[PDB]
Design a protein around this ligand. Sequence first.
Ligand SMILES: Nc1ncnc2c1ncn2[C@@H]1O[C@H](COP(=O)(O)OP(=O)(O)OP(O)(O)=S)[C@@H](O)[C@H]1O
Ligand SMILES: Nc1ncnc2c1ncn2[C@@H]1O[C@H](COP(=O)(O)OP(=O)(O)OP(O)(O)=S)[C@@H](O)[C@H]1O
Ligand SMILES: Nc1ncnc2c1ncn2[C@@H]1O[C@H](COP(=O)(O)OP(=O)(O)OP(O)(O)=S)[C@@H](O)[C@H]1O
Ligand SMILES: Nc1ncnc2c1ncn2[C@@H]1O[C@H](COP(=O)(O)OP(=O)(O)O)[C@@H](O)[C@H]1O
Ligand SMILES: Nc1ncnc2c1ncn2[C@@H]1O[C@H](COP(=O)(O)OP(=O)(O)O)[C@@H](O)[C@H]1O
Ligand SMILES: Nc1ncnc2c1ncn2[C@@H]1O[C@H](COP(=O)(O)OP(=O)(O)O)[C@@H](O)[C@H]1O
Ligand SMILES: [Mg+2]
Ligand SMILES: [Mg+2]
Ligand SMILES: [Mg+2]
Ligand SMILES: [Mg+2]
Lengths: 314, 301, 313, 296, 299, 298
Amino acid sequence: EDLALRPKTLDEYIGQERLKQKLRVYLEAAKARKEPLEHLLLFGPPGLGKTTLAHVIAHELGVNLRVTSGPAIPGDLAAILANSLEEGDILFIDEIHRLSRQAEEHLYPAMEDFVMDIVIGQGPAARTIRLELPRFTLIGATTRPGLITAPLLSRFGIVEHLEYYTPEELAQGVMRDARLLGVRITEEAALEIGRRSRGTMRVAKRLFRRVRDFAQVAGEEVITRERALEALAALGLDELGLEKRDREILEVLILRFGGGPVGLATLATALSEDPGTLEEVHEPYLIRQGLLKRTPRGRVATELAYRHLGYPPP
Amino acid sequence: EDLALRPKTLDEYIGQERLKQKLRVYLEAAKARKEPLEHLLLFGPPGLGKTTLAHVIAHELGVNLRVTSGPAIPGDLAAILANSLEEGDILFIDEIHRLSRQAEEHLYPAMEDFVMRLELPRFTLIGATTRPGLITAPLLSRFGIVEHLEYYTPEELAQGVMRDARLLGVRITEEAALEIGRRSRGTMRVAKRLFRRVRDFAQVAGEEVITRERALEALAALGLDELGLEKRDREILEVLILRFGGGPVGLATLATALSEDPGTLEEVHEPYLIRQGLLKRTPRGRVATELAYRHLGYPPP
Amino acid sequence: ALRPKTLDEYIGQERLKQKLRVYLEAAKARKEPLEHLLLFGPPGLGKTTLAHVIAHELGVNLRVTSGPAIEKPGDLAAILANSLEEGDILFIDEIHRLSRQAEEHLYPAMEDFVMDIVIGQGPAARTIRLELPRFTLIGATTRPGLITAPLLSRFGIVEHLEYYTPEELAQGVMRDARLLGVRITEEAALEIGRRSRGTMRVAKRLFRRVRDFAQVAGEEVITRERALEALAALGLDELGLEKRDREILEVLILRFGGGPVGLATLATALSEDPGTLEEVHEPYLIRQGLLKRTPRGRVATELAYRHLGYPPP
Amino acid sequence: RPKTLDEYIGQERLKQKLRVYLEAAKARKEPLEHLLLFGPPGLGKTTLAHVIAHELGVNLRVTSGPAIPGDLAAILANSLEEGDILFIDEIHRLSRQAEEHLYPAMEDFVMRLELPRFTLIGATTRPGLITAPLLSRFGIVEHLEYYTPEELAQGVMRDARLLGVRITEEAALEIGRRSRGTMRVAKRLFRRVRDFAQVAGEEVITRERALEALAALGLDELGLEKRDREILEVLILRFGGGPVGLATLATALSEDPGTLEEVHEPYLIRQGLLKRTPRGRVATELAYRHLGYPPP
Amino acid sequence: LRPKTLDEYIGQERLKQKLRVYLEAAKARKEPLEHLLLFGPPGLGKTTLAHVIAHELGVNLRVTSGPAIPGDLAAILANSLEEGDILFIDEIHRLSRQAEEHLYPAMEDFVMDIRLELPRFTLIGATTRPGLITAPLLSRFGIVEHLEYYTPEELAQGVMRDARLLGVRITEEAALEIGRRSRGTMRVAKRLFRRVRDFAQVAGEEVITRERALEALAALGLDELGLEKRDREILEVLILRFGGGPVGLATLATALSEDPGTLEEVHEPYLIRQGLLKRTPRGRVATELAYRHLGYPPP
Amino acid sequence: LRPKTLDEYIGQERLKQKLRVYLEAAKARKEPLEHLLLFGPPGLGKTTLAHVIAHELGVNLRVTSGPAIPGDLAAILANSLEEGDILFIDEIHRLSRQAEEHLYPAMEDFVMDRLELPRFTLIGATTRPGLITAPLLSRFGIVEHLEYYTPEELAQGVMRDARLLGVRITEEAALEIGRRSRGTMRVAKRLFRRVRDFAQVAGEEVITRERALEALAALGLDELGLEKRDREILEVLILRFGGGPVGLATLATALSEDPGTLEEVHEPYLIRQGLLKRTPRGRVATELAYRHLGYPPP
DNA sequence: CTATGTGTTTACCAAGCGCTG
DNA sequence: CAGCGCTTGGTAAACACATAG
Ligand SMILES: Nc1ncnc2c1ncn2[C@@H]1O[C@H](COP(=O)(O)OP(=O)(O)OP(O)(O)=S)[C@@H](O)[C@H]1O
Ligand SMILES: Nc1ncnc2c1ncn2[C@@H]1O[C@H](COP(=O)(O)OP(=O)(O)OP(O)(O)=S)[C@@H](O)[C@H]1O
Ligand SMILES: Nc1ncnc2c1ncn2[C@@H]1O[C@H](COP(=O)(O)OP(=O)(O)OP(O)(O)=S)[C@@H](O)[C@H]1O
Ligand SMILES: Nc1ncnc2c1ncn2[C@@H]1O[C@H](COP(=O)(O)OP(=O)(O)O)[C@@H](O)[C@H]1O
Ligand SMILES: Nc1ncnc2c1ncn2[C@@H]1O[C@H](COP(=O)(O)OP(=O)(O)O)[C@@H](O)[C@H]1O
Ligand SMILES: Nc1ncnc2c1ncn2[C@@H]1O[C@H](COP(=O)(O)OP(=O)(O)O)[C@@H](O)[C@H]1O
Ligand SMILES: [Mg+2]
Ligand SMILES: [Mg+2]
Ligand SMILES: [Mg+2]
Ligand SMILES: [Mg+2]
């Protein structure tokens, strides 16, 4: 079937309560005035639901949605904007940061004023025209808003940030995915899967799929809490969703170096790992959970790491 | 229908007083001797009123305005100059820094001497850009007037908010507009956007007059401080003060601790904190000042 | 070299094979394509071989490409649209060398199985969505930190290839000898595995060189002594230490007393730039427990004393 | 529009040698050898070429590098007389295919038509972009230097006479003091002061009116605008005058880093007010003294 | 002048011991030799070694350059290469990242891209240091070997062979001196022999005697250690101006009036090899050999 | 005009002896000379040396330039080369990364791809040995370096120029012209033809020493040969930076110059004459500029 | 083939802590 | 207590890559 089952309605959207509270007001005001929405920008870490929110907003407004990509697209964008746009329709550009700095400058006369500067003609007959565009809506989703030019960031009426989820919302997502796929999972098992998900919906769905694989191979029919725990232990995840490599890093830091300041290169060599791989894959979540610190003298293991690994704090 | 409610007169232009005095002197002098105005260049941070000022100047001079763009244009600019330009009219090129380095070489010889050999008429060029550094020095040296747009005081932003409310049909109070002006970041576009969001909140709530209290409620719902700081901007200072002691941190460590891209944390969030004096860029890293400490209700270091 | 085609023929990744077996069995049971899979680890461990073995176990075709081989997004679009089939596998070796624009075309392809391209070349330009078949993407890389995070989050299965023990390298050497007709013994295979640095490719190369040395001498069986003398001729310690590592340890022990020396002082005593001692020689000395990094400096471990035949500290 | 070497305003040191060279060329009845002129933009190199052309007594053919690779042959074989002068502005931008087509016609006189003899005057602002053969094929190399307040005052007086405006010598001198050693800047400032005085309604631009108009423009005695003073103030007061860096300084000034590097910085340098350290930008003691701040 | 047998090769005895083993085993198995990589300083005989290897196997040779190659590597691989033939690529580290990735399919699976079935062949690369090539490249070479600096006796033997092949009479001591002045390099020794022959020919003599060889070598400005006059000047401005302490970057060009160029790449390596310079962490220090060699009284 | 034999060549001793030996031996055994590489600062007369070598060898010349070269190497080595012909190349260090690799096969075994080539003596010329790759440097059998000229050699060169022109410069004045020359023959010739114009306009036929000194002073040259540009550089440094260390980013900007010719054509002479120092943190006036420019020491 | 403009990576270079005898 | 490491941050300068020409 489909492994990227996206909600169609803002009610099926799960856990962006603070964002949804303002989004409902904006959508209601726009629909009451019989006017298209303001240009909208969504940003945040991967896997939180920007691409799903774009489609949910398009369905809520009732308008047609045209989907484009940043890397897909300077002179082309003029043709797409002139030919493929209708009145009140939404144009969605994923990875809008990938637009070249030259291609974004064509959107300046098109987002605030609904016109476009086009030079039409050959040789001495060349002239300039202002091609009027229908009033539309632009939605952009990106992880790097700082790669967008300032005059373009200034033209977005609404800018919103996608925040992390809670274990209960991740459990709700797991339950919805199980119901749509056809797998019977208990609420406690879904909560256990959610607690090991790193506040991300894609991670929760992937973990549920792996647990389903384990249960199906084992011949089970209902993914009970204890069966889910056994499958997660087979996957090698702690109660914080901490893999074996992260636990190895913490153990090496606590034991071999005494938990004190070390540095990236020394710890990487002690772990037989590439320093960049470590600092870009394993370190960020250890920092987020409070199990690691980047002091000016080097990496330090906190008391949370000592209490989680079962060692006596110093 | 229209949200960029551009004024058409220099009297309706709000608050560029220091620039407006010189502009009035230049325009009156040019009109008195029946000669076209000198070539003019406007630059400054986004949202300050360069295009609006260009249109206002065109209206004040009483001549026609031909609007084009830098990205929209070497063999074209010659045709536009030789065919579409009347005598005494204005050619406005927006984002003029994007002009080709060959199309720029075909422009300044026609700007100094009005010959292309086609005898061009007397015309004035207006250029508006955010990056005058991309303009070649030969082209940059032919501009008779070069001006810089400055930020707006909260009272001028309040005047702009009241004008937008009057034109749209919304009823707002002067004290209500003062809060929106204070929370605006010295920019007119930001003030208009904040007024529109407060208007949406008030219309949904059913209120007919946006008093000061209702405006404050809407602004709190938007998540804005008295300094115009969003939640994402307050999180930076909170993480800096609490998780790092306020001392030097660095871009990479701060970005990792905030689950943020370093580039956006450096170019979208930090400039306004630095402008307000709530952040410092020490060579050892980023440091939270005493203003950031007492703004968030923390005891001084 | 001689690549196995069965997961039982694959030699020495047991914790990885335990996870992979249930994934493959469940994917085949549902008659569905496998998830996008990423293999990362140090070179020479068998990532390409594992990709081929996975393709054989699933029973589908395998289209092999490379990171630098895809210069433009048009190549990736053509491969994904024309060269692929439902359930097939596209293996991209060195996937961290893809350009960022080429990595960002893979997001819809891996998640939604669609693709965004622009066609028209001027005033007739337009955007279309190419609908892709349900395929499987396998990526092999040695630098997972060079992969963009949205791309790294789109992999259903992420696995790590670990170093082989001397016994598994001996098993690989014996398999290679049996396939090549040579009659090596258990002890010689164990010695060749110990001389290796936990890598299968190094073990195979050392076996080939020892085979040449034994063949020119007229011997029909590669006895342990012949392997020992051939490996001594190749210039390896009992731990596979080259002469440069030996003399680095000797300079650390004799000249500085084995105590903290520092990177700059040790490098200038060895006439080496501090970008070759740290990245080419230090990691293996630390791996074997012969070198120790301390805030004061670099310290030679007692194991380095016992290995070099020096009096204990 | 000067015609002779006496009408030229303020290149005295160069003019003394140029007069001798032209006199010798006339006495020998032989055309002058090739001449290369260096100098910052805005100093009047093309005007000097015209003056030389008139003084020698021959015609001038003004050309540039990016003016179109085979057109050089048509130029050199279609519009040259005996002893003619051919002027190429921006000679370092000449294409390579054209670059190895001119020096055969410089020394050997052979590249159509056989060129009898002529002289080439080349003007450029970037000597580093001229290859060694091109620099070695020029007989005379000369440098254009910046003007002085008195020479710029003379230029301002000439412009006022051309435009029908009346100025005193003191006002013209004050305008020329604030010019950045350039004639173009002096003319622009004179036009702005003319606008101010005409709007005021004064028949003669006295020194006091010129000073008032230049204060209304926001100019120091050094010619620094408000933005340059703001850059110095931000550098000194907010960063202690120490190294900062282009990005941090641009963020503090709310300015494009490229604009700050290319428009404002070059005049803060060349005046002793700024340095470009590998660790950032440092304000010198001259910046402290100019702004009325205590020494570091 | 190029030899054609490993016996005729002069002085790579340690490398030749293993090369004979690998070569004989490959010949006995009647299969192409594995890919080979040659390290070492320039001028030691890598191309001559490739020619000797090709003649020993009996197969032909297809010498190629590094920066010579994208669309021509496949052409030379398919057309000129029969069953296993040495394709020598000098300066393999200079390949662009366009044909480097096309080598691995041909090196391992012996097919390149339509897809063409390339025949079996052996590739011989050559660089100066292991670090000049990327790690993926230093993985498909079965044999990795290093060339060593020649001793004065081997250089003298090469000079004598060149003299015999040319028709010039030289005493053993003169050739030994010429080899001693050479920096352990065959091309340098051959060049010095040619210069000495040029100097001794105008004198009209028939035998290149040791004294004439020393006079000719002194004419070009070479001491007993083969140092150029620039190296002697550097040593002089080191000792007689600093006493053996750090030289300092500011004062390096004061006595040279030159950019910080060749001093960082042409002078220091040979001085360190000869032991005249030591890179003490405080700074560059001249050893006792520098003091004694420059005609100074012992300390 | 241009010297033909080595005796007519002015100065450049310690290089005309080795060259004499090599050319005599090459004549004796009758085969083309080995490939030669010439080093030295520009203006020392490398092309003249190539012409003298070709004339003494009794063969032709094929002077070309580096950045003029692709199959044009085959064209110029095919029809324009007789056996044992010199093919002097100027600025050989600026060869393209494509045609350079075709020079080696023409240099070892005299075959270029496909027709074979005769034996030819290629002569190169470049400023710095660091600009030419080691594989190319290894291809030249003979490598020599040109040195500067003493004031007497420049004086006699100026005398030869006067003889070819018709001027009667005295020995004591040509000596001063050579002294103010920066050890370069081209600079000496340029100064002589400037003094010629100055004396012609002054109304004189024989140029004594005092007249030459006055003409050189009016041209803008001091006793050390410094022009107005170098003195201006020193003045700007000393005044606007107190003689302190300044890198080649602020000094070039303050002089309205570029980081190009500056430190390439202007400053090397300043360091050579002990007027500038390349400090790790910048550039210093070395306290001799203060004495030369009449300023109090720091 | 060339040229600019942009995004990404990297090599000094300086500062701040902790130890040793 | 004042050299000797180690660790980190930022700043300028290269590289590589794309579009128009
Ligand atoms: N609030 C939500 N409710 C239900 N499913 C969700 C929600 N948010 C995300 N998902 C699902 O999580 C998966 C990933 O969501 P995406 O919207 O693709 O994340 P993303 O923000 O687009 O990540 P990128 O790589 O930055 S585009 C999809 O299968 C979605 O259906
Ligand atoms: N003085 C003013 N009075 C009223 N509205 C103004 C004024 N200045 C600016 N605005 C408004 O500010 C908004 C944006 O400013 P613009 O006039 O478009 O110039 P600009 O924003 O500086 O150009 P860019 O794209 O940001 S570089 C428009 O909606 C204008 O109406
Ligand atoms: N020294 C001068 N004396 C008299 N008139 C001058 C002088 N310099 C310039 N002019 C006048 O300036 C005009 C010529 O402009 P220039 O300054 O020569 O422009 P330019 O030399 O090409 O410099 P750029 O790089 O184009 S700004 C003519 O009207 C000249 O009369
Ligand atoms: N488990 C294994 N069993 C047998 N041979 C192996 C095994 N792992 C690796 N090899 C051999 O080692 C070599 C490793 O190279 P390869 O797997 O192609 O790529 P990588 O070196 O990136 O893993 C292969 O030639 C393969 O034949
Ligand atoms: N052992 C040797 N015996 C004879 N000649 C040698 C020897 N080693 C090197 N040479 C000479 O060196 C020349 C090329 O060697 P070298 O410069 O090392 O190769 P490359 O130029 O490929 O680096 C050959 O002409 C050869 O005559
Ligand atoms: N020693 C010399 N004797 C006579 N003339 C010389 C001498 N050296 C140089 N010249 C003159 O200089 C000219 C060559 O100068 P140039 O080409 O600038 O030097 P280079 O070839 O080193 O760049 C010749 O015309 C020649 O007349
Ligand atoms: Mg994205
Ligand atoms: Mg702009
Ligand atoms: Mg110019
Ligand atoms: Mg791989």
